[PDB]
């Protein structure tokens, strides 16, 4: 009776009996001992089905409509093709439907509205084609709705926002058009608004300050034009994400009062004007991504009052003036990215105080002066980028004592002297691009100890001497560019570097074959 | 250095004890040690007042304080929150399934949101719930109420959302002329009579759901006036009469379902569904509809779902269904259609079982 | 008017060591936990 429907279900699952080896009604009769099926201990009908993450790869047989007491159906990962069967809308006891991570196409079916007990509709990462039907409003207990990862069309009907119990709205990664309706803020118990990745035109609703239920607001990557309203300062969100759109005007000064924020994202927008220094009282935010804009003016020194900051990205703007030394105050800073600006003057020595600094990138500015020596104290640094600047002086010896360095890029500056031998014991290094400089003298043979190295470009320098013989030990180096230098002698016959796929010795003075 | 108003704080103490959460008594000040479900706003004198009071738990986050299933009750002390703007009860019971308290009236001017969802409340709707003139959102979904719907409800000149689903409500649908009303949900009730005329005077309406009731009479001619209407759901009712002359004014209407009106017994006029670009879902199944499949259902651009099953439709399937590849569900099963079908192979391969044609004798 | 940190001193109601908690899904929400399970804390404007 019920095993009949379970065997039509299994009947439509590609062609594998290895996985559901269990479902065998002649040598395993009780169906409540089968794999992924569960019967509540009283009525002893199947109430829960969990075939999640097995790849059975057929269809959802309509016989699923014949297990009436199913209140849980989790069929994720199985690569089920075809449409969502209509009969799934007469398991009225159903509470929780996860069909996420499959190859289902067709529409979200009308019969879904019959399931007046349903709480979680998880159709994530499928191929459903067609609109988010208005009838999803006729499920009074639905709390998590996510259609993320589909090819859904049509607009978001404001009817969908008149809903008092909804917790989670996941719409990311469809092709939804239209506007953000100013009735959007009638989802009074929602904590997650996600409409990212669609094609929504229109401005931000000025009446968005009433959305105090929201923990996360993600409208990013959506082609939204217009200004960022003042009432956005009333939002209680912790993740404010407005990235990737066409939001013009300047950064609302009222954002300086949104102290609850934990991730602040305005990046890849066409925002102009100065960086509001009031942001300095956002003492507890983790991320500030103002990059991608046309923000002009200096970096506010009050950004050192963001003590809890861990990810600062102001790159690719039109910021001018100096780097503030107060960035030493940010003791939690992992990634500092001020690239592609117009910053003038030297790197402050105070910045050597970010013991947690992990990425440092100031490529593409007008920075001058020398690397401060106190950079010996940046031991936690993973990624060091100072390319395309007017840095001068010498490469500090103590730079070799930043052990966790795996990407060093000093290209494009006027460094002098000979290369430090301590650069050799950067055991974890992977990329070393010191080119377009004025480096002189010997090519330090300690590069034989750069065990994990991948790409050495010390080209375009005044490097004299011979090519070290130890470079044959580098069993990971796939690009060795020594071009435009002053070296001589013959090439070592040891280049035993089976990884090399790109050598460039040229415009040198070698002697041999 | 702001402090709260004392009588409102004691009101909060009594309310919280009454619901079963004694822990709110240790609190040295209610509005500075804020738990999820209580909001406060200070006035000009740096004095906090209580504005939102909510129970129980829809989940963990949002986890309002739950109530004692065996003990709780609704304290009279609510009457002392002179600034209470919203009051929320969800899956919070009481010692004995009680009535809706009448003293909820006494906070008329401030209250703008009253939710009493799934509380097991017994008995009729207090009339003095109407004295809440300033209410914007009223929800009594899934209780056990019966008796009439108070006439005092047309005293909500500013109401926005009204949800009364899941009750034993008797009598007839209100003669509302509520200009601002957006969503009106009276479904799964015993309300009878006809669809009152006054309804179509509430132009702002977008959702009208009267399903699983016993409303009678035909459907109003002037339902065009509802020109903002998104969804109209009248399934499982006692409706009858002739189809309205026109629904053309009903732009933005996306979904209309008259399923289960077994005594409908009317044909579908050609011009009924002409100018409906935005129409998506049309369920007319099991309504004893007579006549032939009108072909102006073919020119419905956004139509995805068309249910006409379990009727007494007759004739051929119109050739212009060849001109329709947008539909995802088309139910013409269990009728008496004569001519053999004119569906192309694109359509048949894509639709598969989602196209129902069985139980037609002539095909 | 803005927004403020949860101040999750009193929001649990049982198991008094009521803390704030970091949640990530790189989208971060504030939660409140003590012992088992998590809570909220709020305000409005």
PDB file of N, CA and C in Angstrom, chain A residues 105-155:
ATOM      1  N   UNK A 105      13.638  21.235 -13.261  1.00  0.00           N
ATOM      2  CA  UNK A 105      13.190  22.395 -14.023  1.00  0.00           C
ATOM      3  C   UNK A 105      11.683  22.554 -13.874  1.00  0.00           C
ATOM      4  N   UNK A 106      11.037  23.182 -14.849  1.00  0.00           N
ATOM      5  CA  UNK A 106       9.623  23.467 -14.732  1.00  0.00           C
ATOM      6  C   UNK A 106       9.336  24.536 -13.687  1.00  0.00           C
ATOM      7  N   UNK A 107       8.058  24.643 -13.346  1.00  0.00           N
ATOM      8  CA  UNK A 107       7.590  25.709 -12.477  1.00  0.00           C
ATOM      9  C   UNK A 107       7.553  25.264 -11.018  1.00  0.00           C
ATOM     10  N   UNK A 108       7.398  26.247 -10.135  1.00  0.00           N
ATOM     11  CA  UNK A 108       6.937  26.007  -8.770  1.00  0.00           C
ATOM     12  C   UNK A 108       5.448  25.696  -8.863  1.00  0.00           C
ATOM     13  N   UNK A 109       5.014  24.499  -8.487  1.00  0.00           N
ATOM     14  CA  UNK A 109       3.661  24.060  -8.836  1.00  0.00           C
ATOM     15  C   UNK A 109       2.582  24.716  -7.989  1.00  0.00           C
ATOM     16  N   UNK A 110       1.397  24.832  -8.596  1.00  0.00           N
ATOM     17  CA  UNK A 110       0.215  25.302  -7.878  1.00  0.00           C
ATOM     18  C   UNK A 110      -0.033  24.482  -6.619  1.00  0.00           C
ATOM     19  N   UNK A 111       0.112  23.156  -6.719  1.00  0.00           N
ATOM     20  CA  UNK A 111      -0.224  22.258  -5.618  1.00  0.00           C
ATOM     21  C   UNK A 111       0.560  22.559  -4.348  1.00  0.00           C
ATOM     22  N   UNK A 112       1.674  23.290  -4.453  1.00  0.00           N
ATOM     23  CA  UNK A 112       2.430  23.688  -3.267  1.00  0.00           C
ATOM     24  C   UNK A 112       1.527  24.426  -2.287  1.00  0.00           C
ATOM     25  N   UNK A 113       0.583  25.214  -2.807  1.00  0.00           N
ATOM     26  CA  UNK A 113      -0.314  25.980  -1.950  1.00  0.00           C
ATOM     27  C   UNK A 113      -1.251  25.099  -1.130  1.00  0.00           C
ATOM     28  N   UNK A 114      -1.468  23.845  -1.538  1.00  0.00           N
ATOM     29  CA  UNK A 114      -2.332  22.955  -0.767  1.00  0.00           C
ATOM     30  C   UNK A 114      -1.737  22.587   0.587  1.00  0.00           C
ATOM     31  N   UNK A 115      -0.427  22.747   0.758  1.00  0.00           N
ATOM     32  CA  UNK A 115       0.290  22.206   1.913  1.00  0.00           C
ATOM     33  C   UNK A 115       0.260  23.219   3.060  1.00  0.00           C
ATOM     34  N   UNK A 116      -0.933  23.377   3.636  1.00  0.00           N
ATOM     35  CA  UNK A 116      -1.171  24.418   4.633  1.00  0.00           C
ATOM     36  C   UNK A 116      -0.456  24.176   5.960  1.00  0.00           C
ATOM     37  N   UNK A 117       0.305  23.091   6.098  1.00  0.00           N
ATOM     38  CA  UNK A 117       1.141  22.865   7.271  1.00  0.00           C
ATOM     39  C   UNK A 117       2.603  23.224   7.040  1.00  0.00           C
ATOM     40  N   UNK A 118       3.007  23.421   5.785  1.00  0.00           N
ATOM     41  CA  UNK A 118       4.415  23.557   5.429  1.00  0.00           C
ATOM     42  C   UNK A 118       5.065  24.734   6.148  1.00  0.00           C
ATOM     43  N   UNK A 119       6.315  24.537   6.567  1.00  0.00           N
ATOM     44  CA  UNK A 119       7.109  25.574   7.217  1.00  0.00           C
ATOM     45  C   UNK A 119       8.362  25.956   6.445  1.00  0.00           C
ATOM     46  N   UNK A 120       9.051  24.991   5.837  1.00  0.00           N
ATOM     47  CA  UNK A 120      10.311  25.239   5.140  1.00  0.00           C
ATOM     48  C   UNK A 120      10.202  24.778   3.692  1.00  0.00           C
ATOM     49  N   UNK A 121      10.178  25.735   2.762  1.00  0.00           N
ATOM     50  CA  UNK A 121      10.289  25.449   1.335  1.00  0.00           C
ATOM     51  C   UNK A 121      11.716  25.759   0.887  1.00  0.00           C
ATOM     52  N   UNK A 122      12.495  24.701   0.667  1.00  0.00           N
ATOM     53  CA  UNK A 122      13.896  24.798   0.267  1.00  0.00           C
ATOM     54  C   UNK A 122      14.032  24.170  -1.118  1.00  0.00           C
ATOM     55  N   UNK A 123      13.882  25.002  -2.150  1.00  0.00           N
ATOM     56  CA  UNK A 123      14.058  24.595  -3.540  1.00  0.00           C
ATOM     57  C   UNK A 123      15.388  25.086  -4.101  1.00  0.00           C
ATOM     58  N   UNK A 124      16.370  25.292  -3.226  1.00  0.00           N
ATOM     59  CA  UNK A 124      17.601  25.988  -3.573  1.00  0.00           C
ATOM     60  C   UNK A 124      18.375  25.273  -4.676  1.00  0.00           C
ATOM     61  N   UNK A 125      19.099  26.065  -5.464  1.00  0.00           N
ATOM     62  CA  UNK A 125      20.062  25.579  -6.451  1.00  0.00           C
ATOM     63  C   UNK A 125      19.454  24.512  -7.363  1.00  0.00           C
ATOM     64  N   UNK A 126      18.350  24.884  -8.009  1.00  0.00           N
ATOM     65  CA  UNK A 126      17.700  24.014  -8.980  1.00  0.00           C
ATOM     66  C   UNK A 126      17.700  24.735 -10.323  1.00  0.00           C
ATOM     67  N   UNK A 127      16.785  24.371 -11.223  1.00  0.00           N
ATOM     68  CA  UNK A 127      16.676  25.019 -12.527  1.00  0.00           C
ATOM     69  C   UNK A 127      15.254  25.497 -12.798  1.00  0.00           C
ATOM     70  N   UNK A 128      14.488  25.788 -11.746  1.00  0.00           N
ATOM     71  CA  UNK A 128      13.082  26.132 -11.921  1.00  0.00           C
ATOM     72  C   UNK A 128      12.933  27.395 -12.761  1.00  0.00           C
ATOM     73  N   UNK A 129      12.031  27.339 -13.736  1.00  0.00           N
ATOM     74  CA  UNK A 129      11.801  28.425 -14.679  1.00  0.00           C
ATOM     75  C   UNK A 129      10.379  28.929 -14.500  1.00  0.00           C
ATOM     76  N   UNK A 130      10.230  30.237 -14.305  1.00  0.00           N
ATOM     77  CA  UNK A 130       8.934  30.812 -14.045  1.00  0.00           C
ATOM     78  C   UNK A 130       8.891  31.622 -12.767  1.00  0.00           C
ATOM     79  N   UNK A 131       7.797  32.347 -12.562  1.00  0.00           N
ATOM     80  CA  UNK A 131       7.760  33.356 -11.501  1.00  0.00           C
ATOM     81  C   UNK A 131       7.544  32.746 -10.124  1.00  0.00           C
ATOM     82  N   UNK A 132       7.880  33.545  -9.115  1.00  0.00           N
ATOM     83  CA  UNK A 132       7.541  33.241  -7.728  1.00  0.00           C
ATOM     84  C   UNK A 132       6.048  33.503  -7.584  1.00  0.00           C
ATOM     85  N   UNK A 133       5.206  32.472  -7.552  1.00  0.00           N
ATOM     86  CA  UNK A 133       3.764  32.708  -7.649  1.00  0.00           C
ATOM     87  C   UNK A 133       3.237  33.433  -6.421  1.00  0.00           C
ATOM     88  N   UNK A 134       2.199  34.241  -6.646  1.00  0.00           N
ATOM     89  CA  UNK A 134       1.550  34.948  -5.547  1.00  0.00           C
ATOM     90  C   UNK A 134       1.006  33.978  -4.508  1.00  0.00           C
ATOM     91  N   UNK A 135       0.668  32.758  -4.927  1.00  0.00           N
ATOM     92  CA  UNK A 135       0.023  31.788  -4.052  1.00  0.00           C
ATOM     93  C   UNK A 135       0.930  31.281  -2.943  1.00  0.00           C
ATOM     94  N   UNK A 136       2.232  31.558  -2.999  1.00  0.00           N
ATOM     95  CA  UNK A 136       3.070  31.267  -1.845  1.00  0.00           C
ATOM     96  C   UNK A 136       2.710  32.136  -0.648  1.00  0.00           C
ATOM     97  N   UNK A 137       1.840  33.131  -0.836  1.00  0.00           N
ATOM     98  CA  UNK A 137       1.275  33.862   0.289  1.00  0.00           C
ATOM     99  C   UNK A 137       0.216  33.049   1.023  1.00  0.00           C
ATOM    100  N   UNK A 138      -0.388  32.059   0.359  1.00  0.00           N
ATOM    101  CA  UNK A 138      -1.440  31.240   0.951  1.00  0.00           C
ATOM    102  C   UNK A 138      -0.896  30.064   1.754  1.00  0.00           C
ATOM    103  N   UNK A 139       0.300  30.187   2.312  1.00  0.00           N
ATOM    104  CA  UNK A 139       0.850  29.216   3.248  1.00  0.00           C
ATOM    105  C   UNK A 139       1.113  29.931   4.566  1.00  0.00           C
ATOM    106  N   UNK A 140       0.180  29.859   5.518  1.00  0.00           N
ATOM    107  CA  UNK A 140       0.261  30.734   6.696  1.00  0.00           C
ATOM    108  C   UNK A 140       1.406  30.403   7.636  1.00  0.00           C
ATOM    109  N   UNK A 141       1.981  29.207   7.549  1.00  0.00           N
ATOM    110  CA  UNK A 141       3.024  28.778   8.471  1.00  0.00           C
ATOM    111  C   UNK A 141       4.408  28.770   7.841  1.00  0.00           C
ATOM    112  N   UNK A 142       4.519  29.086   6.551  1.00  0.00           N
ATOM    113  CA  UNK A 142       5.812  29.100   5.877  1.00  0.00           C
ATOM    114  C   UNK A 142       6.734  30.113   6.539  1.00  0.00           C
ATOM    115  N   UNK A 143       7.897  29.649   6.978  1.00  0.00           N
ATOM    116  CA  UNK A 143       8.852  30.485   7.693  1.00  0.00           C
ATOM    117  C   UNK A 143      10.164  30.678   6.952  1.00  0.00           C
ATOM    118  N   UNK A 144      10.727  29.623   6.368  1.00  0.00           N
ATOM    119  CA  UNK A 144      11.901  29.737   5.511  1.00  0.00           C
ATOM    120  C   UNK A 144      11.486  29.434   4.078  1.00  0.00           C
ATOM    121  N   UNK A 145      11.519  30.456   3.233  1.00  0.00           N
ATOM    122  CA  UNK A 145      11.321  30.312   1.798  1.00  0.00           C
ATOM    123  C   UNK A 145      12.626  30.677   1.111  1.00  0.00           C
ATOM    124  N   UNK A 146      13.231  29.725   0.401  1.00  0.00           N
ATOM    125  CA  UNK A 146      14.375  30.095  -0.428  1.00  0.00           C
ATOM    126  C   UNK A 146      14.337  29.386  -1.774  1.00  0.00           C
ATOM    127  N   UNK A 147      14.271  30.193  -2.831  1.00  0.00           N
ATOM    128  CA  UNK A 147      14.347  29.747  -4.213  1.00  0.00           C
ATOM    129  C   UNK A 147      15.702  30.063  -4.829  1.00  0.00           C
ATOM    130  N   UNK A 148      16.678  30.423  -3.995  1.00  0.00           N
ATOM    131  CA  UNK A 148      18.010  30.806  -4.444  1.00  0.00           C
ATOM    132  C   UNK A 148      18.611  29.781  -5.394  1.00  0.00           C
ATOM    133  N   UNK A 149      19.217  30.277  -6.470  1.00  0.00           N
ATOM    134  CA  UNK A 149      19.931  29.425  -7.402  1.00  0.00           C
ATOM    135  C   UNK A 149      19.109  28.901  -8.554  1.00  0.00           C
ATOM    136  N   UNK A 150      17.991  29.541  -8.870  1.00  0.00           N
ATOM    137  CA  UNK A 150      17.112  29.134  -9.954  1.00  0.00           C
ATOM    138  C   UNK A 150      17.106  30.205 -11.038  1.00  0.00           C
ATOM    139  N   UNK A 151      16.299  29.972 -12.072  1.00  0.00           N
ATOM    140  CA  UNK A 151      16.194  30.913 -13.179  1.00  0.00           C
ATOM    141  C   UNK A 151      14.820  31.568 -13.170  1.00  0.00           C
ATOM    142  N   UNK A 152      14.381  32.006 -11.995  1.00  0.00           N
ATOM    143  CA  UNK A 152      13.034  32.533 -11.838  1.00  0.00           C
ATOM    144  C   UNK A 152      12.893  33.887 -12.524  1.00  0.00           C
ATOM    145  N   UNK A 153      11.732  34.113 -13.126  1.00  0.00           N
ATOM    146  CA  UNK A 153      11.434  35.327 -13.878  1.00  0.00           C
ATOM    147  C   UNK A 153      10.286  36.076 -13.205  1.00  0.00           C
ATOM    148  N   UNK A 154       9.866  37.175 -13.826  1.00  0.00           N
ATOM    149  CA  UNK A 154       8.832  38.019 -13.267  1.00  0.00           C
ATOM    150  C   UNK A 154       9.350  38.885 -12.133  1.00  0.00           C
ATOM    151  N   UNK A 155       8.485  39.780 -11.664  1.00  0.00           N
ATOM    152  CA  UNK A 155       8.860  40.653 -10.566  1.00  0.00           C
ATOM    153  C   UNK A 155       8.553  39.988  -9.227  1.00  0.00           C
TER     154      UNK A 155
END
